[PDB]
Each structure stands twice: as structure tokens, then as C-alpha cells.
XYZ file of C-alpha atoms in Angstrom:
484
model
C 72.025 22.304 21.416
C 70.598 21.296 24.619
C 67.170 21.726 25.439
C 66.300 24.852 28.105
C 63.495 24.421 30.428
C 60.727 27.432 30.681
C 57.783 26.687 30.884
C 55.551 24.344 32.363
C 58.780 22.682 33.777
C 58.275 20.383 37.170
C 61.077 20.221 39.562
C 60.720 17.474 42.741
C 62.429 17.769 45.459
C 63.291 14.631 47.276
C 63.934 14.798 50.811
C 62.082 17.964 50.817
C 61.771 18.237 54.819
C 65.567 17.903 55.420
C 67.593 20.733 56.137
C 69.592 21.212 53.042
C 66.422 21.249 51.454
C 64.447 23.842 53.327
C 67.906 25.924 54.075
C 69.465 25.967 50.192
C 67.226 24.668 48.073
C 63.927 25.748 48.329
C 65.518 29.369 48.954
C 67.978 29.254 45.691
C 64.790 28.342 43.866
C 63.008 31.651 45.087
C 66.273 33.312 44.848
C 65.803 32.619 41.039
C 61.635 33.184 40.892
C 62.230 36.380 42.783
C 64.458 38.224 40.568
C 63.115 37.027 37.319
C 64.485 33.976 36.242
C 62.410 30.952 37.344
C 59.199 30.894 35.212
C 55.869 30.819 37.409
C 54.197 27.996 35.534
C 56.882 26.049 37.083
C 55.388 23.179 39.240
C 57.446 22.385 42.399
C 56.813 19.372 44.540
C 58.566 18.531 47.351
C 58.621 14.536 48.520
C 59.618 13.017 51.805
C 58.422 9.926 53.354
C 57.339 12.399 56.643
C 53.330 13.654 56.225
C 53.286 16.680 56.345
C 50.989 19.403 54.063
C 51.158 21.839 51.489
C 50.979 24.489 54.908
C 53.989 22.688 56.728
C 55.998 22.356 53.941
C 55.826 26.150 52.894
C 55.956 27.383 56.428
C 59.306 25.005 56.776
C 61.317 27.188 53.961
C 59.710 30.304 54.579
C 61.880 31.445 57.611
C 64.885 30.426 54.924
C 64.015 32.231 52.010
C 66.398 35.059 51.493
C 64.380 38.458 51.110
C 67.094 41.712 50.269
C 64.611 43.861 49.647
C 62.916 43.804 52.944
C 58.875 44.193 53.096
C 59.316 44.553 48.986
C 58.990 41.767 47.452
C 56.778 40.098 49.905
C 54.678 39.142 46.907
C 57.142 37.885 45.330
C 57.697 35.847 48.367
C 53.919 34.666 48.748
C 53.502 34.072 44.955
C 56.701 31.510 44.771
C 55.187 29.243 47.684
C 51.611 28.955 45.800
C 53.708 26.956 43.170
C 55.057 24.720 45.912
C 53.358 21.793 46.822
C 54.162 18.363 48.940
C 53.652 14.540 48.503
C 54.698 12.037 51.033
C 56.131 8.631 50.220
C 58.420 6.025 50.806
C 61.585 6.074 48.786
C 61.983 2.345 48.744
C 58.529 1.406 47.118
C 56.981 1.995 44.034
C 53.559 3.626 45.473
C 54.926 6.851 45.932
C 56.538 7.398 42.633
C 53.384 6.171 40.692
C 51.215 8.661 42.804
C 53.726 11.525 42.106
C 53.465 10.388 38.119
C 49.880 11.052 38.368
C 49.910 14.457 39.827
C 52.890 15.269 37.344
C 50.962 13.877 33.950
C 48.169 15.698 35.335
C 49.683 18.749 35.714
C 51.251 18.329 32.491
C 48.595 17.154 30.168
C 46.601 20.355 31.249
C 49.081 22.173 29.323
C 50.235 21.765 25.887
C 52.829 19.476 27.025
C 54.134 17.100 24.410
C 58.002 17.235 26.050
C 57.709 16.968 29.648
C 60.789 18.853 31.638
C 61.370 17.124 34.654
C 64.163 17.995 37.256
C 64.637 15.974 39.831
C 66.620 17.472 42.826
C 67.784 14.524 45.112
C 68.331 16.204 48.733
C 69.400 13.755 49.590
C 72.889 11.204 51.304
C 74.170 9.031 48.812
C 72.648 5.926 50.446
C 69.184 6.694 49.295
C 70.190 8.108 45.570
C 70.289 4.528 44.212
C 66.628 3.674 45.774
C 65.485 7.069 44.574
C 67.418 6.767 40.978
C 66.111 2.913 40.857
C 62.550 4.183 41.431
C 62.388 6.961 39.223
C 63.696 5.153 35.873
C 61.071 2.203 37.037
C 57.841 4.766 37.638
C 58.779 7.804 36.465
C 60.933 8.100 32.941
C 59.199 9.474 29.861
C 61.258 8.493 26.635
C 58.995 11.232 24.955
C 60.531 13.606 27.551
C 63.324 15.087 28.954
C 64.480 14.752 32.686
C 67.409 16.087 34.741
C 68.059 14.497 38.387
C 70.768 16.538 40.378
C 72.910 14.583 42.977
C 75.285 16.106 45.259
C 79.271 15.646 45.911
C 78.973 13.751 49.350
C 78.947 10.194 46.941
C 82.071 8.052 48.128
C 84.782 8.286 50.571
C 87.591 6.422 48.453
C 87.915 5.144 44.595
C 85.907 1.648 45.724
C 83.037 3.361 46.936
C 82.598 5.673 44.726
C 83.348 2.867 41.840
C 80.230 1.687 43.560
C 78.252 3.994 43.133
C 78.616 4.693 39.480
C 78.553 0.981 38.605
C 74.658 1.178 39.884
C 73.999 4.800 38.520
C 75.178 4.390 34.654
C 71.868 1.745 34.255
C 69.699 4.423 35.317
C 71.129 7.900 34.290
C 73.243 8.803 31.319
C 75.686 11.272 31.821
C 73.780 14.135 29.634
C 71.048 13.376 32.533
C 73.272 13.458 35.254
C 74.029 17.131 37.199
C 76.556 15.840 40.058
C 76.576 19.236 42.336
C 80.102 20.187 43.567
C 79.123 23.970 45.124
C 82.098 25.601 44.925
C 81.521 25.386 41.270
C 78.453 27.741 41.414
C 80.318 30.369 43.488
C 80.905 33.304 41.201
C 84.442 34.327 41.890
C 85.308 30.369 40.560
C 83.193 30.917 37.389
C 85.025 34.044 37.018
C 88.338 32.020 36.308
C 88.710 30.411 32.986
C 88.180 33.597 31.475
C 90.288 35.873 33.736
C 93.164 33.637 32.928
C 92.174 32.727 29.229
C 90.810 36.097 27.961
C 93.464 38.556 28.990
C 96.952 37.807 27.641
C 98.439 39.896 31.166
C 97.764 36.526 32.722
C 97.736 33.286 29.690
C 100.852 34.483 28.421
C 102.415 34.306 32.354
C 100.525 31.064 32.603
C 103.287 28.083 32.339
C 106.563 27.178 34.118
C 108.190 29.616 31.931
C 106.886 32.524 34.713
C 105.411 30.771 37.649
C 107.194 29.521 40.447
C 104.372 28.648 42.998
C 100.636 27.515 43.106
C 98.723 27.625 45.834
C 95.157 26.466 46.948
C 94.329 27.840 50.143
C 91.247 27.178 52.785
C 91.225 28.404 56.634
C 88.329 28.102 59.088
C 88.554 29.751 62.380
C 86.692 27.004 64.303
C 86.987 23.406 64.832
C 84.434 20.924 64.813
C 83.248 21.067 68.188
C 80.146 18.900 68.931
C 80.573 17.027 65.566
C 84.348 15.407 66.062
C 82.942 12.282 65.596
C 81.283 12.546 62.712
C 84.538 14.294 61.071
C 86.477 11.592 62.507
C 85.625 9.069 59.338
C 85.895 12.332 57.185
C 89.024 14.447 57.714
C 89.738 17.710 56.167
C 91.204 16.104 52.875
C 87.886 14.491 52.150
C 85.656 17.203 53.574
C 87.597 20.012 51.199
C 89.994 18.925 49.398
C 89.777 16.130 47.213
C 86.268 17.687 46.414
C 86.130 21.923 46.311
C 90.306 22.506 46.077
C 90.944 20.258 43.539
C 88.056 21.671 41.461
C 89.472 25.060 41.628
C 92.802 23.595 40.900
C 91.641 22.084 37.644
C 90.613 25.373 36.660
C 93.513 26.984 37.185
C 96.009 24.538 35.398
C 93.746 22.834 32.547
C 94.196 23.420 28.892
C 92.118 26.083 26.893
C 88.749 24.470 25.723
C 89.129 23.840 21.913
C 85.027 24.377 21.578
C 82.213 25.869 22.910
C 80.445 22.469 24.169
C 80.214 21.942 28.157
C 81.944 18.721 27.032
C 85.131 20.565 26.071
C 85.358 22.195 29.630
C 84.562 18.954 31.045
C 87.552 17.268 29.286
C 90.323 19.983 30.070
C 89.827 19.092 33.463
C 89.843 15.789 33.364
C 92.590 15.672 30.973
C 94.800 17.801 33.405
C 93.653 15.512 36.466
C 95.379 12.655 34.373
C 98.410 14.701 34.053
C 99.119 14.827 37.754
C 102.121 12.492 39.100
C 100.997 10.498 42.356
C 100.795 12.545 45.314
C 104.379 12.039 47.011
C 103.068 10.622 50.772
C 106.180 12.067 52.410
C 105.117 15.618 50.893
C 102.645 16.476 53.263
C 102.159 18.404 56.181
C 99.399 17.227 58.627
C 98.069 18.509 61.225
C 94.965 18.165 64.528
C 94.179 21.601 66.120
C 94.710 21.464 69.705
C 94.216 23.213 73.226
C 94.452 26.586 72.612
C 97.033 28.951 73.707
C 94.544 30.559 75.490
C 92.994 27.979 77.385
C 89.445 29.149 75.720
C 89.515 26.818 72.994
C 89.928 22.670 73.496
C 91.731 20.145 71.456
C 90.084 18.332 69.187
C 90.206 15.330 71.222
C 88.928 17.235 74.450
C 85.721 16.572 72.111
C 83.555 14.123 73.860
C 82.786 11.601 70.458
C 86.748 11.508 69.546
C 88.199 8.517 70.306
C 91.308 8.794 72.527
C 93.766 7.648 69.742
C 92.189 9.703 67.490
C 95.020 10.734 63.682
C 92.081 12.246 62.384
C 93.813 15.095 60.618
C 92.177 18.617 60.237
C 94.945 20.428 58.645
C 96.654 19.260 55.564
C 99.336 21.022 53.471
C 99.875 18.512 50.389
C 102.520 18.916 46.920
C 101.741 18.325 43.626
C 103.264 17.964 40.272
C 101.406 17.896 37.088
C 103.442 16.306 34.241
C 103.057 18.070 30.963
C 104.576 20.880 29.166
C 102.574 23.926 30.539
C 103.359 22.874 34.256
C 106.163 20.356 34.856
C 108.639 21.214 37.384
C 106.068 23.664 38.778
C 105.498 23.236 42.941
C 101.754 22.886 43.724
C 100.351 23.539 47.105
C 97.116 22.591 48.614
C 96.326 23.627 52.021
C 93.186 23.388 54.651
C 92.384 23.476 58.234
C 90.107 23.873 60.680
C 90.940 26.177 63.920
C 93.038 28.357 62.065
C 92.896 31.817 62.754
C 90.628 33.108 60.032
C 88.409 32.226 57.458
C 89.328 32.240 53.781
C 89.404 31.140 50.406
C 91.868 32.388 47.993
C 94.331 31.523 45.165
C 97.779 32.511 45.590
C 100.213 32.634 42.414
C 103.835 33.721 42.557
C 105.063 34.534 39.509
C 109.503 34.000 38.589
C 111.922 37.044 38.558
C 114.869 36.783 35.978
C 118.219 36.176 37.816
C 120.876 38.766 36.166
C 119.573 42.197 35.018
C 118.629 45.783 36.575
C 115.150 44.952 37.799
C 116.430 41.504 38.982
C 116.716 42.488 42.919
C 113.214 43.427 42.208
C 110.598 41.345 44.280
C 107.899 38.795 42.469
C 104.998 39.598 41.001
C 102.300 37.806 42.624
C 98.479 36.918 42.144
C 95.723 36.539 44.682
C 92.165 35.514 43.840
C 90.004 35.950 47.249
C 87.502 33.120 46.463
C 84.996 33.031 49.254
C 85.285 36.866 51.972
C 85.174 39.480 50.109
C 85.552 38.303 45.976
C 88.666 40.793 45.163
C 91.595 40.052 42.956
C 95.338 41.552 43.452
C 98.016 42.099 41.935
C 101.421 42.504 43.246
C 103.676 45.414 41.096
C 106.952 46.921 40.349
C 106.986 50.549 39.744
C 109.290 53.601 39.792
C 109.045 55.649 42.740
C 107.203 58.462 41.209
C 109.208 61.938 40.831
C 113.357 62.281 41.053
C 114.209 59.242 42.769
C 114.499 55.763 40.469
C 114.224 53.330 43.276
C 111.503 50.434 43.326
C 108.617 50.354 45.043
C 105.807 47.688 45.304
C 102.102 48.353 44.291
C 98.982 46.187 45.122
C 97.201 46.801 42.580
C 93.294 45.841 43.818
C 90.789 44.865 41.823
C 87.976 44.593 44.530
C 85.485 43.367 42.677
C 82.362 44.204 45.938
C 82.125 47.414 44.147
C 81.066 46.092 40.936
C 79.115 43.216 42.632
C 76.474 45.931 44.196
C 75.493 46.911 40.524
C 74.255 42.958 39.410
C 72.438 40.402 40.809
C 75.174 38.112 42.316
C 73.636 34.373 43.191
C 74.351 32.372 45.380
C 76.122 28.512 44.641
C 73.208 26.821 44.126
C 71.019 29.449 42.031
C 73.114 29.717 39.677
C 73.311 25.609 39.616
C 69.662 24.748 39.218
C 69.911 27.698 36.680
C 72.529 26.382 35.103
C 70.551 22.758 34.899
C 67.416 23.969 33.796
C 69.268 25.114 30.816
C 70.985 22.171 30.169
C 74.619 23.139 30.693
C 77.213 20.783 32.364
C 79.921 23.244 32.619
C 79.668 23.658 36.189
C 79.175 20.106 37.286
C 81.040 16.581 37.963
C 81.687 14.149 35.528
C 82.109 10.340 35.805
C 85.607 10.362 34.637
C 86.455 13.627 36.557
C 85.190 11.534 40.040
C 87.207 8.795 39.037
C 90.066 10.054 38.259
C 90.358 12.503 41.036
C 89.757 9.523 43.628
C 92.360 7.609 41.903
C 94.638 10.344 42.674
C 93.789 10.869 46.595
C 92.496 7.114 47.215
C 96.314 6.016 48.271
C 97.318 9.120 49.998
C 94.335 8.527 51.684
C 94.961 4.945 52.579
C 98.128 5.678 54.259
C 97.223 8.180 56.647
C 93.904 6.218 57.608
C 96.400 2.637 57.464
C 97.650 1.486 61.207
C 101.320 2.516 60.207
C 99.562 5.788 59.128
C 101.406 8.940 60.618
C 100.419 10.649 63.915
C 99.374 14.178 63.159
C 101.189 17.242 64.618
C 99.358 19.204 66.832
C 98.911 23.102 66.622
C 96.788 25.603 69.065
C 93.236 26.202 67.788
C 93.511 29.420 66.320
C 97.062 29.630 64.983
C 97.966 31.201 61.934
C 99.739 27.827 60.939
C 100.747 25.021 62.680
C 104.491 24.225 62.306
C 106.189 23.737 59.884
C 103.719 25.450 57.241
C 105.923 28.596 56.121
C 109.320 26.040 55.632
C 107.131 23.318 53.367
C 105.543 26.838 50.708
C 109.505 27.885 50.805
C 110.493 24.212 49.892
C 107.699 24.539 47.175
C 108.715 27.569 45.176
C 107.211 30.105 47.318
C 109.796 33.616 48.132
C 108.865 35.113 51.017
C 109.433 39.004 51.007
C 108.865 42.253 53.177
């Protein structure tokens, strides 16, 4: 139903010189041109108000672009930067757009271009989106066309900003124009779930507070944010990953089955389950700000030089949730994150209920992990007889290392497979309105009361613990059975 763009398709680029631009975007879009699916009568223009030429502009990404087959495909390389050009302009005046609609018409009135397909990719902070979105439906918006402008998730920092923001996007962009980029999203392992869990009755008939005791969200980094603290300061590890890429996944995991096959129907199982969820319980938290290290070879996160003295700014958070309705009430949700943990990791971790009186009843829990981000596996915890005379118990983990298969396909990364996916028109993978506003109604007054003056003091823990304290009591107070 919605349109696909193939041919003689022109994506801009704005804010083509910065580095998410010449780091991820330019080399997604070869990633897709080199292995087939990005069509070379595609125009690409990058924009920036810096003046810099065609040469600059392709020598800027080229270091970037990702090349896995080595000295092959070195005309692939050298064929995808021919279609790559560069225009500089202000973003806050109209000159720049109306030059860029020439080249564009131009372009497309040499082909037998009727519909212009226009994607606009705004690399970009939100500050400059609304200049940029302003300036594009004044200059350059073709009713007798279709175009596509991607934003990204940075937008707002609470429910009043990103209110805001909205309030001066919905004049310019409808929502079937609108691609709002959320990267975790793209990553294949989180595509992966809505069928793993809906498509195999092992798991949907499991799925419910009938068999599952404990939810978990998990994120660990093994660094801090040395050299940046003051940036992150403002930010905090609930807004940098949680409110944003966790609750995503979460939403995937506990949402309804999609009653149709339209984006739209994916798009309101989420954001009917984000209405579902009670308030976040303030006193259910566990907060933390990584510290000296045991060591001695790691600071604090205050020993950082643009930290305030005083600084709460947490960078671990362990926080509850409930989600009343009848698939998951009663069930204990956990999202976790920090910084200056001891690894790094990404992973869903589901513990599924034993029955109470019965032979196999001393038997442990079966148990589900979903590595997200190092290597994309799946296990599954087991019962089994001890094969041969004896009939005791013994555990399997059953893996389902998906690396193995992953060698024999073409595996993109985030953003690849999100500029493919808006090219074709598909809003599965991306951020509605309501979605953003409803999940910042949800975190806006947790947030508000640790940022408030009467706002809690964070504990600390070593850089590079497993988990500061505290962490393994609050999963056993929410459902979680530890075992051997």
C-alpha cells in the first residue's frame, strides 16, 4: 500500500559534514548500494552550511565506509561516491533550499519523473529540525510527490519538551511522512522478536503471568564517561538508554499480537501496552554513580574535571514496573543500565514459574536469554533426565547461537536496514507521536524527582563492578530465583 522508492529516488543529507553523518550514514547508504539494494540512479546530496566540494565531501566518508570484502568491491566503493554530491547552505534561510530545488527538479525532470521520491535524512540535533522541517515544507514540498524526512531519537529531555517539539512538527510533517529513528530498532536480533515470541507456540503459549515470574531488560558498559561527564550530567543513564532503546525492546516483548498486517497495527500494540503500564513506583528504584575504582586505575565519576562537585547525576539505574492488563498484571518488570560496569551487554532475561507440589517441582526454572547486542545468541534453560540408569535432573542450556547462521546472510547494520526500511515506506521500525508521548508521560515524573532538590543522592559503586549494591536483593524482590 505504500509507495517503494527505486528509481530515480533523491536522498539529502542535512548536516552532511557532521560526524554521524560521515560515520553512519553515508556508510549504511553504501552498505545498502554495495550489496545490491540501493538503486544507482539514486541521487545523493549532502547539505551543510560549511563549503566544502564534491572531493571533500567524498573523501570525508570514504575512510568510514565499511568494505568486508577487502580490495573486492573497490568498485563498488568508487561507483557509490560518483552518485554523491554536496551543496552548501544555511539552514535558517530560504536560499539554500531553493538552490537545492533546482538541482533536484533538474535532476528529476531529466528522467521520466512524474512522482518525485524525496528522502530527507536530517543529521542533525533537534534544535535545527524545526528550521530545517520549516524550510523544506516552505521551498521544497511537491504535492505531486512523495517525500520522507527521517529525524532521530535525541528530540526532548522530558514530556514538555518533547510536547514542544511535536506541537511545531505536526504543521509540517504528517505522521505517514515522518520516520523518527530509534536505532535499536534496526538491530537485527530486536527485529527478530515479535516473531520468535508470536510464531512458535514453545514461547506465546508461556507468554503471560500464568508462566512468567520475571522480566528483565538489561544494558552494561564497561566504561564511564570519562572526558564527557559534563555533557552526561544533564542526560543520565535513564535518558541516554532507557526511556529511549529499553523501553522499545520492552514494548516488544509485552505488547499484544498485531491484529493486521499494516505497520500501523505494530505501531498500536506498543503504544497500547505503554498505556497499560502503572506509574513507575519512585521508591522502586535502585540508583547508582560509578566511582573510584577498586583498583585505583579507574576514577569516580566526579574525579571528572566538567562534573560539578555535588554532582546526583545517576549512571546506573535498576527501575520496577507493572503493566496492568490481563496478559501481565502482577508480573515484576526490571529495567537495568550502567555505565562502568564490568562488561558490555545487551540481553533479555525471562524466568519462567515452576509449579509448587508435584515430582518435577524441586526442579529449577526454565529461563530465557536473548543476547541483543555481543554475540546475537538465544538460550534456553532445560530440565532433562540424566541420560542412562540414573532418573535424577539435570539442567541443559540449550544454545541457539545464532553467529553461525549470521555468516550465511547479509546481516546490516541499525541504520541500513532503517533507510531500507524508509525507502520502502514501512513504519514498523520507527517512533510514533503517541508512542513519544506516552512513553515520556511515563518517565517525565520519575524523572523529575531524581533531578528535583529533594531528589535522592545516588549510591556509589567501583567502576567496574559487576553490580553496585544492592542489585541481586532488588531482581530477588522482583520475581527473580536465583539458582546454582
Amino acid at each position: 500500500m505504500a509507495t517503494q522508492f527505486d528509481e530515480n529516488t533523491v536522498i539529502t543529507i542535512f548536516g552532511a559534514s557532521g560526524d554521524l553523518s560521515k560515520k553512519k550514514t553515508f556508510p549504511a547508504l553504501f552498505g545498502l548500494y554495495r550489496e545490491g539494494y540501493l538503486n544507482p540512479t539514486t541521487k545523493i546530496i549532502g547539505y551543510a552550511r560549511s563549503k566544502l566540494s564534491n572531493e571533500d565531501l567524498r573523501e570525508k566518508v570514504k575512510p568510514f565506509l565499511k568494505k568486508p570484502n577487502g580490495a573486492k568491491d573497490d568498485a563498488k566503493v568508487n561507483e557509490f561516491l560518483s552518485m554523491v554530491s554536496y551543496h552548501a547552505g544555511p539552514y535558517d534561510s530560504d536560499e539554500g533550499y531553493l538552490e537545492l530545488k533546482k538541482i533536484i527538479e533538474e535532476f528529476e525532470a531529466e528522467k521520466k519523473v512524474d512522482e518525485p521520491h524525496r528522502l530527507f535524512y536530517l543529521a542533525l540535533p533537534p534544535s535545527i529540525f524545526i528550521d530545517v522541517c520549516s524550510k523544506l515544507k516552505e521551498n521544497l514540498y511537491t504535492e505531486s510527490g512523495i517525500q520522507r524526512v527521517i529525524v532521530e531519537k535525541p528530540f526532548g529531555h522530558d514530556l514538555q519538551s518533547a510536547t514542544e517539539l511535536q506541537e511545531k512538527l505536526a504543521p509540517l510533517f504528517s505522521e505517514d511522512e515522518l520516520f523518527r529513528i530509534d536505532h535499536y530498532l534496526g538491530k537485527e536480533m530486536v527485529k527478530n522478536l515479535l516473531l520468535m515470541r508470536f510464531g512458535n507456540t514453545f514461547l506465546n503459549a508461556a507468554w503471560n503471568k500464568e508462566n512468567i515470574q520475571s522480566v528483565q531488560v538489561v544494558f552494561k558498559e564497561p566504561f564511564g564517561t570519562e572526558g564527557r561527564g559534563g555533557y552526561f550530567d544533564s542526560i543520565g543513564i535513564i535518558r541516554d538508554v532507557m526511556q529511549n532503546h529499553l523501553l522499545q525492546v520492552l514494548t516488544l516483548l509485552t505488547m499484544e499480537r498485531p491484529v493486521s498486517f499494516d505497520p500501523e497495527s505494530v505501531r498500536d500494540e506498543k503504544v497500547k501496552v505503554l498505556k497499560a503500564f502503572s506509574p513507575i513506583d519512585h521508591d522502586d528504584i535502585l540508583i547508582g554513580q560509578y566511582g573510584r575504582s577498586v583498583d585505583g586505575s579507574k576514577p569516580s565519576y566526579l574525579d571528572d574535571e566538567t562534573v560539578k562537585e555535588d554532582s546526583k547525576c545517576v549512571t546506573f539505574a535498576a527501575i520496577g514496573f507493572k503493566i496492568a492488563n490481563e496478559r501481565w498484571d502482577g508480573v515484576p518488570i526490571v529495567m537495568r543500565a550502567g555505565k562502568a560496569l564490568n562488561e558490555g551487554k545487551v540481553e533479555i532475561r525471562i524466568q519462567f514459574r515452576r509449579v509448587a507440589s508435584g515430582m518435577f517441582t524441586d526442579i529449577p526454572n526454565n529461563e530465557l536469554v536473548i543476547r541483543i547486542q555481543p554475540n546475537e545468541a538465544i538460550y534456553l534453560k532445560c530440565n532433562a533426565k540424566t541420560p542412562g540408569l540414573a532418573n535424577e535432573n539435570q539442567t541443559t542450556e540449550l544454545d541457539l547461537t545464532y553467529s553461525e547462521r549470521y555468516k550465511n546472510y547479509w546481516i546490516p547494520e541499525a541504520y541500513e536496514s532503517l533507510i531500507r526500511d524508509a525507502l520502502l515506506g514501512d513504519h514498523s521500525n520507527f517512533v510514533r507521536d503517541d508512542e513519544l508521548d506516552v512513553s515520556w508521560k511515563l518517565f517525565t515524573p520519575l524523572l523529575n524527582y531524581l533531578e528535583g532538590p529533594d531528589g535522592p543522592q545516588p549510591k556509589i559503586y567501583p567502576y567496574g563492578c559487576r553490580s553496585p549494591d544492592g542489585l541481586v536483593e532488588f531482581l530477588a524482590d522482583h520475581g527473580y530465583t536465583f539458582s546454582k
